[PDB]
Symmetry: D2
Subunit: 307 residues, 4 copies
Amino acid sequence: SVDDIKSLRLITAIKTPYLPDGRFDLEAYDALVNMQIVDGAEGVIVGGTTGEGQLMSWDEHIMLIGHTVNCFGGSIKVIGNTGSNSTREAIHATEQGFAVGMHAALHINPYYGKTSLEGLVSHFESVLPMGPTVIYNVPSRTGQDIPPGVIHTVAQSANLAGVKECVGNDRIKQYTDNRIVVWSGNDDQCHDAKWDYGATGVISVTSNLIPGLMRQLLFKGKNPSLNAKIMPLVNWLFEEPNPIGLNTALAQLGVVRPVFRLPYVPLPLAKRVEFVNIVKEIGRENFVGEKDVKVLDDDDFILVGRY
Amino acid sequence: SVDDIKSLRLITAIKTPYLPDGRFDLEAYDALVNMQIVDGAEGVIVGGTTGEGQLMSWDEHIMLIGHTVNCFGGSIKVIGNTGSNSTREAIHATEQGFAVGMHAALHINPYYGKTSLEGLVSHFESVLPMGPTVIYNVPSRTGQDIPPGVIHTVAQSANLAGVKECVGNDRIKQYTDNRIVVWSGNDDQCHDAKWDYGATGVISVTSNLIPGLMRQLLFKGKNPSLNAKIMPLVNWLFEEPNPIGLNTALAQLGVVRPVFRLPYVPLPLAKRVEFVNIVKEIGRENFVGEKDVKVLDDDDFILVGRY
Amino acid sequence: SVDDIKSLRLITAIKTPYLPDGRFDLEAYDALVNMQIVDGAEGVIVGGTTGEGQLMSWDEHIMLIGHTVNCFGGSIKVIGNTGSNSTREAIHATEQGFAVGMHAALHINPYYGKTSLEGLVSHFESVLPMGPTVIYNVPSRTGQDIPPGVIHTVAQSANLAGVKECVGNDRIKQYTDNRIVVWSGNDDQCHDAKWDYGATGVISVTSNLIPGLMRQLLFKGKNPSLNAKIMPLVNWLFEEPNPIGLNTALAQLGVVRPVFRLPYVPLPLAKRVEFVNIVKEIGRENFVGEKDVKVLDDDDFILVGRY
Amino acid sequence: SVDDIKSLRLITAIKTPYLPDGRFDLEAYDALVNMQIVDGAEGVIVGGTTGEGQLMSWDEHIMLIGHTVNCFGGSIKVIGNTGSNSTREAIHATEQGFAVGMHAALHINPYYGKTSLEGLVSHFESVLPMGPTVIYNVPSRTGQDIPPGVIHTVAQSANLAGVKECVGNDRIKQYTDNRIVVWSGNDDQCHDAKWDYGATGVISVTSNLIPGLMRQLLFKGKNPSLNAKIMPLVNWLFEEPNPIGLNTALAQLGVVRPVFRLPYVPLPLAKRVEFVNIVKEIGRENFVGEKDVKVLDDDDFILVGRY
Ligand SMILES: [Br-]
Ligand SMILES: [Br-]
Ligand SMILES: [Br-]
Ligand SMILES: [Br-]
Ligand SMILES: [Br-]
Ligand SMILES: [Br-]
Ligand SMILES: [Br-]
Ligand SMILES: [Br-]
Ligand SMILES: [Cl-]
Ligand SMILES: [Cl-]
Ligand SMILES: [Cl-]
Ligand SMILES: [Cl-]
Ligand SMILES: [Cl-]
């Protein structure tokens, strides 16, 4: 149901952990989703940008979606990132994603191979009939800012749940004033988006590391001292493009193996020493996992190009 | 060999024509490549941005690369667009592309799922050893500008042929002053890139339509009036994201079927009328094909989502 | 659990129904699985020989498996047919199959590209660790009778549930006397198999049509007259290779569309007239669906090659 | 043309060699094909049963086809095994194969998921329009003997080059007496097929090892003692299902790496010792490669399940 999605506040763009040979680490993955559920995350994006969907083959991706529904579908909402810059792929991945039982679809606009505003309408209308859909706007990554007019055109579909919006709180307000549910895509803006700009919540990267704190941040009420306290973490996580920092942090925490699928590559030593201090400053207990945080040696990391 | 690639002036990023069901129209494609050859185009990019590589499955792409080499490899240089935002795909497509006898690879930086500068080097160094390589910078599309420092780092490989640069002529000059071969990726800039900024040539969209005229611009010396003559065609070609304009124009010229793979959608009626006038002004004899240019009506066009 | 699969008695090799363009018709499929549940079937093979697994791409197949698990997993055992003549495919299909929550895998011996008995052991040991496994012997189709020595060798794995045996009741006896669970894969034999030869049950084609009668046959005691009654149906079902008859019969009953993926093709008119009389003799009320059975015209059937 | 294929007398079903990680070893492959050309083989089957087409993903397969055409097409006829038990795959693989320039297609009848005789005609008629076709009958592997009637039905197409026939010389004679070109697919029968039953040639496994000797058997009249001389090699090659013996023999000769894709596993030590004697008796100079034949130890062999 659409309204079940519209009412979600904390959705995690869950990271996809790997085995040393590059394959998904499903044991680690399950542990990750369990810690999300425990600390009150209400949804997960499967193979989003943070989940490195762009580096998956489709059978892996659909497997991971079906897996998450199968294991956790009764505790958390499952949102498959089945979007693509290719309409054919979007169509195919969306209908199969829904068939294995995902609750909603995340659809970005075609990136790289940008299309016209007419083309966008055609693209979204190809997948909107399939079920609850969250449209995903991230111009910094795609090359194209989806204008409000396009969002209003396709909002005629009952199946539009809302927008994962990344251009900023000004855009969110443009939408939330006009009866369109929005989740902030930026962790450094999402407190204000929720409390001041009418966002329903966040689709979050940082909730991978501190789900409990991100829950407190969105559920209880305004709280700038909590927002300020997590900000040094948030900044560290985005000095290089996401999910490079997240990947690096989760491995320092022991919850995932220090394995990267290329083109991503871990943060250097100096940055890794820094994270240890950010953890110490915020308190290890707020971070996922139980293991003492490590700095890790350069030689600990495994980069995979062929898998 | 790298020097054979370094000397090419006119490279056409060839359009990929479709059958009504959405499969490749090899009959129309073959005729397109021959018309490139007749008018002195020196190389082709297979499945580039213009060629809609982004919408192809890999079997189809490798097929088209091998087809092009088999039928035309003796008369024209074949450069497979085997780049990707995924290193695994880039590695895999590039070695398979070379195995079927392509002459060079075009490699963009990872788009959408952007990586760090360190990751860029890792990405590029995974494929440079395989053969002659052209690195492709188009930050409008990718969201990441490849810094000259990165280009200079990877230029330690003897397999770097040069750069398809899209940021502008001033960037081109930064490279050409420093021993780096550059092809302009901007038709509205390529005349001046060649004569004022040290560029070796162009990797062209517009040459799909007027290959003879583009050749003249790079081969004969500064010609401000020929350059001014093509400008209205170029401006038309890029009013919407390439290859929408090109796809539309080739259908109007009757050299391809009016079949579009989504998310692309033809230019509207008014622009199509405009194109008939543009052809008139420049002269029909300068455009590919023999058939009278048509406006085409809306319902002539076939939009393919499932293929 | 392995013991759970071992205690299954009535398992249906469910047919895979299609839409006019050759894609899976999930609406029809869901209704077929429900009718199996209502008349007591305890498990289903998904994409078996009868389910035309041979004609699926793996994305489609894992989708179907995950769909069946998601919709029916709590009411019925889902056995994914993840075997292949390629160990790589078998490995990959099986692990993905279990990850989306299938209860067991069906594993044939490599067919067409036959391997040595040693190769057979290597192949089965590649997949047995992954979960509960039914080994499928059908030398009339594979070209290779799996010898009991091989079965006894691989039976060292705690994950071997049993054998889907197609050679005959005397083979079955060899196994059941020696503590190996067996399901007959021959409908014309399965009654004797279960009552006289120790078979735990059947993996059935005919239950697709008359699940209630197949249940009665296997559950309520030795019944020579009931067995004799179904035999005209069973014989008709296998005049041409299965599932040609079943596909035809289900269309005639109106429970699936008259759509065939090639290389399969429907039974001719005279045979379809014959099916109407078999239905009248057994009684329409014993067959899946509510609609009057039809002969159907030759022109009703759609044959799909490209999908 | 079709006639160009019909006059071919010695065709090799070339082995596909692998690198330690399971990928194609194009360097070894190129040496194998070169050796075939040197000793007068006039065509190759690419990815046949002997070439382990059944273990290949389609992209590496079309790659290998396109590679063989690009590198050797001027010197040898390239026949892609694009046949399948799935008509969709057969259609798809065949046209893509011809697109990259293969000279003919090898087409088997659907194995394992066997179809009706009407089904077979449908299946073959989907691919016969694409290019010169060789129909492949080997019921010991398919479970279905293609009857003469089906061949005569499909022979109405001018694109039927002929039949690769494995059932025996008597079958060959029913065809050759009725204007249909045949290649024997049995090395132990091919001498007599040619000289006594009107076969045009062989499509050979054994020519992978001793191409010159096979040439002599087929181009130089009856020679029962040359024929008897090769027979112990042929018997050794087929004691376990082909290509297990050939893969083993080629490793021993050092012209390929001792690498197997599962389910295939090498012949045991005793047979390897036996091969060394077979080589001594026939004479090393007749076999491919210059290196001294080795026994090889169990330890040397690499079995790949995941690639
Ligand atoms: Br590790
Ligand atoms: Br462009
Ligand atoms: Br058309
Ligand atoms: Br009962
Ligand atoms: Br229908
Ligand atoms: Br009735
Ligand atoms: Br080796
Ligand atoms: Br020797
Ligand atoms: Cl953004
Ligand atoms: Cl600049
Ligand atoms: Cl059997
Ligand atoms: Cl027996
Ligand atoms: Cl045979």
